[PDB]
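Q: What structure does this chain adopt?
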Amino acid sequence: MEFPDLTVEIKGPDVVGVNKLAEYEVHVKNLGGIGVPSTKVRVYINGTLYKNWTVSLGPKEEKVLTFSWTPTQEGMYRINATVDEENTVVELNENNNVATFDVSVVLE
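A:
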């Protein structure tokens, strides 16, 4: 067809202080033994786009994206990452290409 299985992962600190810089990583890999050149990985915070990357992935290839974020307001933040948001490639799984990560920001 052929139909890859793209997946993404969010990892990093769970609780961060206010007005402090934290580093997070996105782990994106192919699991369909076919490479996608069009592979776009994006990250949102509370629905709003924070950052984006365009990359290419070969068969069973993994790439690591990084970003650094300083939350200036205290509160709960939900960080989501998606790959192929625009749906340019049809995959073997469609729910297996999103990652949800919960962050708590404190004034501490």
